[PDB]
Amino acid sequence: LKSIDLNIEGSKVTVKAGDIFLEPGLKAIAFNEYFDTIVNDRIISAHSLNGTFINLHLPSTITQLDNHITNYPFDSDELSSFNKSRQEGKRQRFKIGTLCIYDDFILTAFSKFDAQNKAVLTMPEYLEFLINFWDKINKVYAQQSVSTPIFGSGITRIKEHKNITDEDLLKIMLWTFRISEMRFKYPAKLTIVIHKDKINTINLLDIKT
Amino acid sequence: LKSIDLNIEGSKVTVKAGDIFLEPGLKAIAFNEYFDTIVNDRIISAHSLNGTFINLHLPSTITQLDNHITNYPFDSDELSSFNKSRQEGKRQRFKIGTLCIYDDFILTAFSKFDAQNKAVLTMPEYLEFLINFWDKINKVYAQQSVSTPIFGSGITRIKEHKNITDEDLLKIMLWTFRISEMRFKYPAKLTIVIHKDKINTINLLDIKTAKNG
Ligand SMILES: Nc1ncnc2c1ncn2[C@@H]1O[C@H](COP(=O)(O)OP(=O)(O)OC[C@H]2O[C@@H](n3ccnc3)[C@H](O)[C@@H]2O)[C@@H](O)[C@H]1O
Ligand SMILES: Nc1ncnc2c1ncn2[C@@H]1O[C@H](COP(=O)(O)OP(=O)(O)OC[C@H]2O[C@@H](n3ccnc3)[C@H](O)[C@@H]2O)[C@@H](O)[C@H]1O
C-alpha cells in the first residue's frame, strides 16, 4: 500500500502503512483517563498500543514511566476528578485529550475506563477527544512532524458504534483535524500510520480521491 | 444551484435554499440551554430564529409556549443544573441537544447562555450537540421529514472559531448526520434549509462531497 499525501486546507497530511514505533519523531500513543501503566488482564491490555508501548518500547523502565507521570507538570485545568475508591490502578482522572510528553512519545488520555469493557467512549466524547488533541498538537507542535495511529480502532468500545469501521474512524480523524487546523496558520505536520497487518482491510480510495 | 439531493449511505438528504417557516412538516428551531422565551436586548435576540419564531410564528401565544415548556414531560437524564441566582430568564438548564416538541416545531437546547456573549459553545460542545440531536431525531422521527437550518451560523460564538463559514458548518452537519445515521436502519428524512439570502455564500457542489464522510 502506497503512502498518500492529502492537501487539507494548504497543509499536507500523510496516510501511510507502517509501524508507529518506527516513525522518527513524535509518536502519539493512546493511554486512558488515568494514564494507567499496569499491564495485566484487569487494567491495560497487552493487545493495545498502550500495552505494547509499556511492554516493548519504553525509554527505560516502568518505574521511570510511573515517576514521569507522577511528577509531570500538568496544568490544573487538565485535572479532572479523583477516584478515591479505585482498588487497582491510578486514581487521578485527566480531561480527555490531555497530553503527557515523554521523550519522542506523546501520551494522551484517550478512553475512559470501565471494569468490564476496559476502554469506553461515547461518540461525542470521541469527537471531543479529537478536537482537543488536534488543537493541542497544532499549538504546541506547529510545523513539527507528529505521527498517530487510528484512534479508537483497537479495543475501545464507542457506545452505539461497536462495529464502526477503521475507514470511518480515519475519515473522522481527517475532518476533525481539518476543523482544528483551519484556525492555525502553521499546523502540525500530521502522519496517520495504518498498521501493516490491517492495510487490506482499509479501503483508502474514498480518502485518496 | 438552489437545491441538491445527496445519497448519504443509502438515505436521501436534501439541502435547499428557502424559508424554514414555510416547510411543511417538522421544523427544528435552536433555543438555548434554558429554553428561554424572553425576546429583548438582554435574553433572546429578535435577530435569531429563536426570536423570529417567538415574535412571528408561534402556534398561539408566548404564555402558551411558556406553559408548554413548563409542563413538558422531559426525562430525568435531560436535566442539567438549576441556576438559582439567575436574575432574568428561566433557571432550569437542560443538556445540550434536548428536544421539546411543540406542534410542528422541534425546539432544541442548542447554545449555552452567557450574560455578555449571549450564545456560546466550544467546538466539542457543537459536535456533541449535533451527534446528540441527530441521534434523537433518527430514533424518534425515523422515516419522517425533519427540516433544520444551519446550526451555529447565526449569532452563536463557537469558541476559537468566531469566523467559521456557513459552508463549513453545513459540512460538519452532514458529516455528523452520516455518523449518526449509519447506526439506524431507517433514519429521519433530513432537509437542511439555507436562508435564501445566504445561498450565494454556499457552493452546493462542494457540499456534495461530504456525503462520503
Ligand atoms: N505498531 C503499530 N503501528 C500502527 N498501528 C498499530 C500498531 N499496533 C497496532 N496498531 C493499530 O493502531 C490502532 C489503535 O490501537 P490502540 O491499541 O491504541 O487502540 P485504541 O482503540 O485507539 O485505544 C485503546 C484504548 O484502550 C485503552 N486500554 C484499556 C485497556 N487496555 C488498553 C488504552 O489506554 C486506549 O485508550 C488499531 O487499529 C491497532 O490495530
Ligand atoms: N427563515 C429562515 N429560514 C432558514 N434559515 C434561516 C431563516 N432565518 C434565518 N436563517 C438562518 O439560519 C441559520 C441559523 O440561525 P439561528 O438564528 O438559529 O442561529 P444559530 O447560531 O444556529 O443559533 C442561535 C442561538 O443563539 C441563541 N440566542 C441567544 C440570544 N438570542 C438567541 C438561540 O437560542 C440559539 O441557541 C443562520 O444562518 C440564519 O441566517
Numbering used by the authors:
A (entry chain B): 65 to 273
B (entry chain A): 65 to 277
Paper text:
The ThsB genes encode Toll/interleukin-1 receptor (TIR) domain–containing proteins responsible for phage detection, while the ThsA gene encodes an Abi-triggering effector protein.
PcThsAMacro also exists as a u-shaped dimer, and the structure is very similar to EcThsAMacro, with an RMSD of 0.9 Å for 215 Cα atoms. Unexpectedly, in the final map, we observed unambiguous electron density for an adenine dinucleotide with the distal ribose linked to a five-membered ring in the ligand binding pocket. Liquid chromatography–mass spectrometry (LC-MS) revealed that the PcThsAMacro bound nucleotide has a mass corresponding to IAD. Although both PcThsAMacro and EcThsAMacro were purified using the same method with imidazole-containing buffers, IAD only copurified with PcThsAMacro. We show that IAD is a considerably stronger (~30-fold) ThsAMacro ligand than ADPR. In both crystals, the symmetric u-shaped dimers stack against each other, forming open-ended higher-order oligomers. The ADPR/IAD binding sites are located at the dimer-dimer interfaces, but neither ADPR nor IAD is directly involved in subunit interactions. In both structures, the N termini of the macro domains are localized on the same side of these linear assemblies, which is compatible with oligomerization along the two-dimensional surface of the bacterial cell membrane.
